[PDB]
Amino acid sequence: PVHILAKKGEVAERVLVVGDPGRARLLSTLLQNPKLTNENRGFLVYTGKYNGETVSIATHGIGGPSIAIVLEELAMLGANVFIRYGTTGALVPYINLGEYIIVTGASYNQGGLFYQYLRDNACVASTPDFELTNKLVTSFSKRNLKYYVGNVFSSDAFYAEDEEFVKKWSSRGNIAVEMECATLFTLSKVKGWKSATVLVVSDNLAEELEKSVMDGAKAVLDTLTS
Amino acid sequence: PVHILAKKGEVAERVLVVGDPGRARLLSTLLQNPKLTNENRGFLVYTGKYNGETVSIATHGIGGPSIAIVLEELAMLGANVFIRYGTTGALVPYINLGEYIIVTGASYNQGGLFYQYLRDNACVASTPDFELTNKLVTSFSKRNLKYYVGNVFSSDAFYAEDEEFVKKWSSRGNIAVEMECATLFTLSKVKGWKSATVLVVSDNLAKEELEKSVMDGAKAVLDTLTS
Amino acid sequence: PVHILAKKGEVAERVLVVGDPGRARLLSTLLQNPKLTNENRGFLVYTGKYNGETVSIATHGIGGPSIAIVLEELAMLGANVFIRYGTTGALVPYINLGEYIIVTGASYNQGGLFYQYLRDNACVASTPDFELTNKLVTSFSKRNLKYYVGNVFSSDAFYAEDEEFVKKWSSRGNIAVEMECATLFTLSKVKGWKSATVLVVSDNLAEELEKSVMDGAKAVLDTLTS
Amino acid sequence: PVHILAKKGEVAERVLVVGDPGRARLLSTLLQNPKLTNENRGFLVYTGKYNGETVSIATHGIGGPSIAIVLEELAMLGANVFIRYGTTGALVPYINLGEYIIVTGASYNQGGLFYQYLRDNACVASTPDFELTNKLVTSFSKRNLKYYVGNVFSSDAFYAEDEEFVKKWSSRGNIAVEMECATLFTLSKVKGWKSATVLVVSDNLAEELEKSVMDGAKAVLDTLTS
Amino acid sequence: PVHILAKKGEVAERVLVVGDPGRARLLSTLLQNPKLTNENRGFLVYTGKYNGETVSIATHGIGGPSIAIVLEELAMLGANVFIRYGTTGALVPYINLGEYIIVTGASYNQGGLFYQYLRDNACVASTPDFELTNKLVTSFSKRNLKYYVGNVFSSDAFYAEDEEFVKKWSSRGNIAVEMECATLFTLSKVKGWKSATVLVVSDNLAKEELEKSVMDGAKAVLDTLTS
Amino acid sequence: PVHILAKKGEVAERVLVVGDPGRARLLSTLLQNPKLTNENRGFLVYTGKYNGETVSIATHGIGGPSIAIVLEELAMLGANVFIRYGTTGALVPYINLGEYIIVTGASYNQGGLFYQYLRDNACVASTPDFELTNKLVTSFSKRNLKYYVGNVFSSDAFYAEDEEFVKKWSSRGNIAVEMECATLFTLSKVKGWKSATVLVVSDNLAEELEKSVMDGAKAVLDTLTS
């Protein structure tokens, strides 16, 4: 690997991936004896223990191309189970800020990265691992956290204008919008990794936040070590 | 409707859909007082009771265009919950004939029917209802039936040649191939219906037996539909 | 064959295909000594004689994927000449219910089945056999039937909405809409089969009907056996 | 019109179009009292009489974009019936040099010009006028000419390489390759013009020629004026 | 070649290409001892000298398919440097009729000719040779001619309707529209030829005069080609 | 802006953008009185003076989606001139490590981000600003640095396999491969910003490095303030 410079044995098989390096550092506090194993290119990676298991928390930056690079290199270092923990904008009225969304699939526009990996324009089912996702639901339910289960649209252009945005994507079965779930799910299916995702609603297109991010992180870490 | 000619209220809200009219007839014997509510164009639809609950068993033919028409017309007659029960060809070697596959998503080639409904070529997530699919897993487990959970490729050309077929679709996360799950899942997401699918493995690309497998799984699906 | 379980020798080289099993059974009364050679999966197939030749009438269901399977299996049993006889909705105001349309070509949205068979998105000319089609015109003339010759749009989504449907397809040279001739024509040109199509107008998007179907069926049978 | 500077009244309703200015000049000798009504940009157009009717012979250059412009301008001047007469390379072994191909449809790769005119990638049936085409068959028969009826592939890249060229297009129902009938047919169906095409085989990818061109030209003129 | 029927060595390595045969003839009078090296199919090609250097002026007709054939055949006859000199319609209001546009790149709709040459739908950068384009800017500046530098949209359908034409292409970084730059640039990149383009503005979508503009710019192009 | 939290007046009109936060910090040393104006999400942005002008050095992360976000927000804060300074893998034999490439255009696979911004699949010319790029050449020439001018392929999948990679892209006129030039150029053309790019060759697919990066940075800063 040329972006994540951690040595083999420094990355755990179980990894919690976040887009914001700042969140990676903040969540490392939930691990026992956390150690920084990479800082190159801003991709902070911490490794420690939790619930009798070794786990790593890694930064993936923003966008499909960026997360694909991080997942590929972490895998080269031993990782094989990834749970995405990010933020999202809800596309439906009833979901409130600070609540969570457990992702069941990802809609996306074809092209670029997908074409290079799949070699044609087939719409391959972009879904998380069945069992891992159910473990997430169980964990969030045990911690009495309010969540919704559903598909999300993985956008590549956060600023491209679309006057029909909310109605378009929500009418297509998506309850939220984010940017890297489709890449995570599809690449994992091709590579044989087990992946899932949970998002914190930080906006609704249709301190309390710190509490939300922290609460959800504990639930994800429980899932990763169960 | 112009294809399904059922009379007012003859169709249940929950429907078990199959591609073979012969299977619809056969499975209708699992229902209490089954009645033939439609026979037009060969699309046999029966309605009766299972565990005290009213349900229908409907024929959808072969292919996306056919199942789309049947789902649209059943919905106009009052249906809003659909569980497809079909046959499939496995794409991986560890799955045996007669076992079952509970579908979690569907891969497909874009264009045609999807372009007309979606209005562009976006790859909209073609997935079943989460809750309903989990209920199916529970039902099959309770009846000690051997199943696998995974995605399938919904093909439009049964006889089209592809020398790299198995490796291509299996390397893409699909464990089996059939022809209408992608249409079922996507149209349901768009129209607001709750759908799911269970398939009986009849071939592995990697009669008494088949009928027994079909009958055993049908009970598990019906349990789910009336739960 | 997996869906049509007729024994080889029971399917004629000349086949009249219809989408409705009910029409197959009704039209079988026009043959001499008809025998049901298949009913599996609802695909009724009858074989008998008409003006000195053996002919089969087969059901193809609805949609490209369905007719493709039926055609491939009938061919594996010995069929090589197909004439589709179905229903259609006119796209132009001057065509009346009960009249006929002899098809000269089919417009279609590419993808799916065409991509699997052609291996790319080329717009292969989807046309019927020239000779067979002219014989159809001659047969319908001889019987004094009212027909029109033109292209049709083979739709894959009967219920999908399009606010400009009639204007769009009629301005693209199509005079009616149906669902399987694009598949019939293209697959035939690829496999080397001789095919054609006649449609009965049952709607105009822009007793008598029973007689319309029967009258045109006789014209089609004369052609198949000419 | 911007490219064809003929004055209105100088272009006939019936037009024989050829790609080579030189063939336009040569074939003008078959008309009575021919007059050059345009030479701008090399697009020679001649107008005269033949068996009681006024007819024009026009040059269309090479390629879809070129013929599209010429057709649009000839139409703005009063033309509404077009018959292309060009050269082609056979894709099947039994067709010999000097023989003719009466075109029934055109296969093409979508995009560019078709996207600009149709507004999306729909595979609109690219076929000639049914009546006009049958009249061509009759005319060529009467003159005892050797012809074949079939589809052709309208290529946009004469020199692009394709190791499977002949096998691919011949297996797709095409018996010859040319460059502008897909444009001719589709644009005609959209604009409401009546069009057809006959080609002289000058190569087989799978004195005498001068006479072949002249013989078929007479057949085409009889059709245009029938 | 089967379209350009020139005899051995009658075509120069450097060629000024134009779409109008009439312009080729007219500009040939700027050359020392001009000779007509081809007239087949109307594609007039002349060869002569300019500033002691041998050069050719060739006709390419209209559209990508036509210019591709002509460029391929000229290259088979020894040409490897091409500068297109055509006419264009401006897409922005500040450019006046008779002024010039030195092209830096070409926008285009995919498919057809590009698919056959590139073998897929990748958007390969359709740009001219950097060095040659800079030489054109210098040449035009030396002759005090009014020019603008920018990208153009290479259209395949002159008469196809588009109610949002000007705003669409101008908002996409294009300052003018014509029909064969995309083909010229892309084919040249693939075949190893050095190409560039200069256009005379004959219309703004936002005879004596035109001929003068055409003549003045032709000298600047010829200076560049023989530099 | 929600990713780059710098206040208006804290970002200069002229910006040098790099993918690696580490390079942003290292190059800030070349500015007079540099100040850190943003660190949120790891997107380090420094602002200072150079050659009598105010300039900013900003981090854009990896990939089209990531750089699009950074450019959009910097623009919202006043930036309008951007020069990309990154690393690349050469696709041609003759270019050596440590040397530079001044980009004249970017090839790319359509889809995702481009579709969302352009609203269809047109291949819009992805080129840098003419004048700015020439200023770069002048600046690199004045500092006696070895550079090559040419197009690059902007890949979205750094790890997707392609056995024909080098020959494919180099035969298409690209001399190097990177990941965000196409997004930079195209978005700038749409938004009206002036952009350019120079890359340091760090690999050839067909301390000394520190020196190369530093030398090139001075040349880019000269260009930005000229």
mmCIF file of C-alpha atoms in Angstrom, chain B residues 13-218:
data_model
loop_
_atom_site.group_PDB
_atom_site.id
_atom_site.type_symbol
_atom_site.label_atom_id
_atom_site.label_comp_id
_atom_site.label_asym_id
_atom_site.label_seq_id
_atom_site.Cartn_x
_atom_site.Cartn_y
_atom_site.Cartn_z
ATOM 1 C CA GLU B 13 -54.071 -8.106 0.089
ATOM 2 C CA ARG B 14 -51.339 -10.732 0.528
ATOM 3 C CA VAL B 15 -50.320 -12.757 -2.483
ATOM 4 C CA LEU B 16 -47.970 -15.650 -3.131
ATOM 5 C CA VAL B 17 -46.918 -15.337 -6.780
ATOM 6 C CA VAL B 18 -45.501 -18.114 -8.962
ATOM 7 C CA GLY B 19 -44.519 -18.267 -12.615
ATOM 8 C CA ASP B 20 -46.104 -21.646 -13.391
ATOM 9 C CA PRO B 21 -49.932 -21.835 -13.558
ATOM 10 C CA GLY B 22 -49.606 -25.509 -12.736
ATOM 11 C CA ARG B 23 -47.861 -24.693 -9.462
ATOM 12 C CA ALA B 24 -50.587 -22.196 -8.565
ATOM 13 C CA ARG B 25 -53.210 -24.904 -8.996
ATOM 14 C CA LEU B 26 -51.155 -27.432 -7.045
ATOM 15 C CA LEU B 27 -50.442 -25.072 -4.137
ATOM 16 C CA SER B 28 -54.090 -23.939 -3.993
ATOM 17 C CA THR B 29 -54.816 -27.298 -2.353
ATOM 18 C CA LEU B 30 -52.954 -26.066 0.733
ATOM 19 C CA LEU B 31 -55.679 -23.430 1.230
ATOM 20 C CA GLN B 32 -58.917 -24.038 3.097
ATOM 21 C CA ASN B 33 -61.719 -23.323 0.609
ATOM 22 C CA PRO B 34 -59.797 -22.366 -2.565
ATOM 23 C CA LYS B 35 -61.700 -20.568 -5.340
ATOM 24 C CA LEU B 36 -60.501 -19.799 -8.880
ATOM 25 C CA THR B 37 -60.810 -16.012 -9.122
ATOM 26 C CA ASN B 38 -59.181 -15.700 -12.581
ATOM 27 C CA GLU B 39 -58.205 -17.826 -15.580
ATOM 28 C CA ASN B 40 -57.934 -15.218 -18.368
ATOM 29 C CA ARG B 41 -54.756 -15.494 -20.488
ATOM 30 C CA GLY B 42 -53.664 -18.481 -18.424
ATOM 31 C CA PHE B 43 -52.868 -16.356 -15.369
ATOM 32 C CA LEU B 44 -54.506 -18.590 -12.753
ATOM 33 C CA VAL B 45 -55.343 -16.808 -9.485
ATOM 34 C CA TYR B 46 -56.863 -18.666 -6.506
ATOM 35 C CA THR B 47 -58.120 -17.211 -3.211
ATOM 36 C CA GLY B 48 -58.779 -19.051 0.045
ATOM 37 C CA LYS B 49 -57.703 -19.257 3.671
ATOM 38 C CA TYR B 50 -54.526 -20.334 5.451
ATOM 39 C CA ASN B 51 -54.301 -20.345 9.262
ATOM 40 C CA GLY B 52 -57.580 -18.429 9.335
ATOM 41 C CA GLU B 53 -56.164 -15.680 7.109
ATOM 42 C CA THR B 54 -57.269 -14.860 3.566
ATOM 43 C CA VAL B 55 -54.589 -15.092 0.906
ATOM 44 C CA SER B 56 -54.255 -15.490 -2.857
ATOM 45 C CA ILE B 57 -51.898 -17.514 -5.063
ATOM 46 C CA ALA B 58 -51.278 -15.925 -8.464
ATOM 47 C CA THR B 59 -49.544 -16.913 -11.705
ATOM 48 C CA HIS B 60 -47.114 -14.389 -13.232
ATOM 49 C CA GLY B 61 -45.671 -16.135 -16.280
ATOM 50 C CA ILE B 62 -42.051 -15.686 -17.351
ATOM 51 C CA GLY B 63 -39.969 -12.515 -17.500
ATOM 52 C CA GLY B 64 -40.009 -8.959 -16.223
ATOM 53 C CA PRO B 65 -42.617 -7.593 -18.641
ATOM 54 C CA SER B 66 -45.076 -10.336 -17.677
ATOM 55 C CA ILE B 67 -44.645 -10.077 -13.912
ATOM 56 C CA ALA B 68 -44.870 -6.252 -14.073
ATOM 57 C CA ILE B 69 -48.288 -6.429 -15.754
ATOM 58 C CA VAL B 70 -49.551 -9.029 -13.273
ATOM 59 C CA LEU B 71 -48.298 -7.131 -10.221
ATOM 60 C CA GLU B 72 -49.823 -3.865 -11.464
ATOM 61 C CA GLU B 73 -53.215 -5.452 -12.062
ATOM 62 C CA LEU B 74 -53.242 -7.379 -8.776
ATOM 63 C CA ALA B 75 -52.471 -4.114 -6.984
ATOM 64 C CA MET B 76 -55.424 -2.469 -8.740
ATOM 65 C CA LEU B 77 -57.543 -5.289 -7.330
ATOM 66 C CA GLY B 78 -56.308 -4.682 -3.787
ATOM 67 C CA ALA B 79 -53.000 -6.522 -3.397
ATOM 68 C CA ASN B 80 -50.048 -4.842 -1.655
ATOM 69 C CA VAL B 81 -47.887 -7.661 -0.258
ATOM 70 C CA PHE B 82 -46.166 -10.052 -2.693
ATOM 71 C CA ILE B 83 -43.928 -13.035 -2.068
ATOM 72 C CA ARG B 84 -42.563 -14.712 -5.196
ATOM 73 C CA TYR B 85 -41.914 -18.430 -4.931
ATOM 74 C CA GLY B 86 -40.033 -19.709 -7.966
ATOM 75 C CA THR B 87 -37.254 -21.973 -9.225
ATOM 76 C CA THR B 88 -33.632 -21.074 -9.844
ATOM 77 C CA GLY B 89 -30.256 -22.263 -11.059
ATOM 78 C CA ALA B 90 -27.478 -22.066 -8.469
ATOM 79 C CA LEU B 91 -24.221 -20.308 -9.359
ATOM 80 C CA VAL B 92 -22.073 -21.741 -6.554
ATOM 81 C CA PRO B 93 -21.053 -25.409 -5.989
ATOM 82 C CA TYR B 94 -22.030 -25.830 -2.312
ATOM 83 C CA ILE B 95 -25.781 -25.411 -2.888
ATOM 84 C CA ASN B 96 -27.661 -28.646 -3.583
ATOM 85 C CA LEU B 97 -30.739 -29.316 -5.705
ATOM 86 C CA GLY B 98 -33.949 -29.020 -3.699
ATOM 87 C CA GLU B 99 -32.551 -26.571 -1.156
ATOM 88 C CA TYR B 100 -33.811 -22.979 -0.935
ATOM 89 C CA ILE B 101 -32.534 -19.469 -1.523
ATOM 90 C CA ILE B 102 -34.058 -16.511 0.292
ATOM 91 C CA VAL B 103 -33.291 -13.479 -1.867
ATOM 92 C CA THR B 104 -31.664 -10.331 -0.454
ATOM 93 C CA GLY B 105 -31.249 -8.357 -3.678
ATOM 94 C CA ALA B 106 -31.172 -8.562 -7.467
ATOM 95 C CA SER B 107 -28.501 -7.759 -10.061
ATOM 96 C CA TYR B 108 -29.733 -6.877 -13.555
ATOM 97 C CA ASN B 109 -28.775 -5.400 -16.914
ATOM 98 C CA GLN B 110 -30.260 -1.923 -17.412
ATOM 99 C CA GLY B 111 -32.582 -0.640 -20.119
ATOM 100 C CA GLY B 112 -36.019 -1.637 -21.364
ATOM 101 C CA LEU B 113 -38.567 -1.971 -18.599
ATOM 102 C CA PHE B 114 -36.316 -0.265 -16.048
ATOM 103 C CA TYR B 115 -35.729 2.729 -18.323
ATOM 104 C CA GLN B 116 -39.455 3.149 -18.976
ATOM 105 C CA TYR B 117 -40.291 3.070 -15.250
ATOM 106 C CA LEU B 118 -37.271 4.901 -13.788
ATOM 107 C CA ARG B 119 -36.887 7.368 -16.685
ATOM 108 C CA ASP B 120 -33.092 7.129 -16.842
ATOM 109 C CA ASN B 121 -30.363 4.542 -16.273
ATOM 110 C CA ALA B 122 -29.735 4.952 -12.560
ATOM 111 C CA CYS B 123 -28.981 1.695 -10.757
ATOM 112 C CA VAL B 124 -31.765 1.916 -8.178
ATOM 113 C CA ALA B 125 -31.262 -0.576 -5.316
ATOM 114 C CA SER B 126 -33.410 -3.608 -6.209
ATOM 115 C CA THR B 127 -34.075 -5.062 -2.772
ATOM 116 C CA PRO B 128 -37.012 -6.811 -1.024
ATOM 117 C CA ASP B 129 -38.708 -5.580 2.145
ATOM 118 C CA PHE B 130 -36.330 -6.024 5.101
ATOM 119 C CA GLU B 131 -38.980 -7.079 7.654
ATOM 120 C CA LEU B 132 -40.696 -9.555 5.349
ATOM 121 C CA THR B 133 -37.427 -11.189 4.297
ATOM 122 C CA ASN B 134 -36.407 -11.680 7.933
ATOM 123 C CA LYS B 135 -39.792 -13.284 8.598
ATOM 124 C CA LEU B 136 -39.109 -15.747 5.780
ATOM 125 C CA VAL B 137 -35.767 -16.716 7.306
ATOM 126 C CA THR B 138 -37.494 -17.349 10.642
ATOM 127 C CA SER B 139 -40.277 -19.401 9.028
ATOM 128 C CA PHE B 140 -37.887 -21.603 7.079
ATOM 129 C CA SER B 141 -35.708 -22.103 10.157
ATOM 130 C CA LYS B 142 -38.725 -23.199 12.200
ATOM 131 C CA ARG B 143 -39.510 -25.905 9.640
ATOM 132 C CA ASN B 144 -35.864 -27.065 9.600
ATOM 133 C CA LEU B 145 -35.476 -26.407 5.876
ATOM 134 C CA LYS B 146 -32.040 -25.951 4.279
ATOM 135 C CA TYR B 147 -31.700 -22.451 2.864
ATOM 136 C CA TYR B 148 -29.062 -19.898 1.906
ATOM 137 C CA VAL B 149 -29.399 -16.123 1.907
ATOM 138 C CA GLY B 150 -28.028 -14.030 -0.938
ATOM 139 C CA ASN B 151 -28.414 -11.998 -4.129
ATOM 140 C CA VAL B 152 -29.444 -13.321 -7.540
ATOM 141 C CA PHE B 153 -29.005 -12.193 -11.134
ATOM 142 C CA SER B 154 -32.359 -11.625 -12.885
ATOM 143 C CA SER B 155 -31.712 -12.572 -16.521
ATOM 144 C CA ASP B 156 -33.867 -11.553 -19.483
ATOM 145 C CA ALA B 157 -32.441 -14.112 -21.937
ATOM 146 C CA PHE B 158 -32.619 -17.723 -20.780
ATOM 147 C CA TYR B 159 -30.876 -19.018 -23.899
ATOM 148 C CA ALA B 160 -28.373 -16.245 -24.656
ATOM 149 C CA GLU B 161 -24.767 -17.497 -24.752
ATOM 150 C CA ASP B 162 -22.114 -16.323 -22.294
ATOM 151 C CA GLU B 163 -18.901 -18.344 -21.944
ATOM 152 C CA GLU B 164 -18.068 -16.566 -18.684
ATOM 153 C CA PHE B 165 -21.590 -16.703 -17.216
ATOM 154 C CA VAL B 166 -20.998 -18.502 -13.910
ATOM 155 C CA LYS B 167 -17.720 -16.803 -12.977
ATOM 156 C CA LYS B 168 -19.061 -13.395 -13.983
ATOM 157 C CA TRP B 169 -22.249 -13.409 -11.944
ATOM 158 C CA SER B 170 -20.898 -15.440 -9.024
ATOM 159 C CA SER B 171 -17.912 -13.096 -8.683
ATOM 160 C CA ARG B 172 -20.477 -10.281 -8.521
ATOM 161 C CA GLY B 173 -22.023 -11.542 -5.277
ATOM 162 C CA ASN B 174 -24.876 -13.545 -6.792
ATOM 163 C CA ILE B 175 -25.535 -17.127 -5.726
ATOM 164 C CA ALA B 176 -28.273 -17.965 -8.236
ATOM 165 C CA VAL B 177 -30.037 -16.874 -11.417
ATOM 166 C CA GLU B 178 -33.697 -16.436 -12.304
ATOM 167 C CA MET B 179 -35.736 -13.923 -14.309
ATOM 168 C CA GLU B 180 -38.057 -11.642 -12.387
ATOM 169 C CA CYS B 181 -36.775 -10.652 -8.936
ATOM 170 C CA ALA B 182 -35.198 -7.402 -10.162
ATOM 171 C CA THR B 183 -38.549 -6.339 -11.640
ATOM 172 C CA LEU B 184 -40.470 -7.428 -8.539
ATOM 173 C CA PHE B 185 -38.181 -5.582 -6.119
ATOM 174 C CA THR B 186 -37.743 -2.367 -8.094
ATOM 175 C CA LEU B 187 -41.384 -1.953 -9.095
ATOM 176 C CA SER B 188 -42.421 -2.651 -5.512
ATOM 177 C CA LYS B 189 -40.071 0.034 -4.174
ATOM 178 C CA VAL B 190 -41.526 2.537 -6.647
ATOM 179 C CA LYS B 191 -45.207 1.602 -6.200
ATOM 180 C CA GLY B 192 -45.158 1.165 -2.424
ATOM 181 C CA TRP B 193 -45.636 -2.603 -2.127
ATOM 182 C CA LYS B 194 -43.958 -4.974 0.331
ATOM 183 C CA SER B 195 -42.199 -7.815 -1.488
ATOM 184 C CA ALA B 196 -39.818 -10.731 -0.951
ATOM 185 C CA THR B 197 -38.710 -13.927 -2.697
ATOM 186 C CA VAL B 198 -37.818 -17.542 -2.008
ATOM 187 C CA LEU B 199 -36.525 -19.865 -4.732
ATOM 188 C CA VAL B 200 -36.255 -23.647 -4.991
ATOM 189 C CA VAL B 201 -32.958 -24.798 -6.506
ATOM 190 C CA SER B 202 -33.770 -26.910 -9.566
ATOM 191 C CA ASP B 203 -30.331 -26.834 -11.216
ATOM 192 C CA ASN B 204 -26.713 -25.983 -10.423
ATOM 193 C CA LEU B 205 -24.735 -24.255 -13.177
ATOM 194 C CA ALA B 206 -21.494 -24.647 -11.215
ATOM 195 C CA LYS B 207 -39.917 -34.843 -10.272
ATOM 196 C CA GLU B 208 -40.929 -36.372 -6.924
ATOM 197 C CA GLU B 209 -37.984 -34.645 -5.270
ATOM 198 C CA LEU B 210 -38.830 -31.264 -6.804
ATOM 199 C CA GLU B 211 -42.520 -31.473 -5.912
ATOM 200 C CA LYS B 212 -41.695 -32.342 -2.305
ATOM 201 C CA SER B 213 -39.311 -29.392 -2.065
ATOM 202 C CA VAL B 214 -41.900 -27.087 -3.620
ATOM 203 C CA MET B 215 -44.600 -28.279 -1.210
ATOM 204 C CA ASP B 216 -42.469 -28.024 1.942
ATOM 205 C CA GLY B 217 -41.311 -24.490 1.193
ATOM 206 C CA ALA B 218 -44.794 -23.335 0.197
#
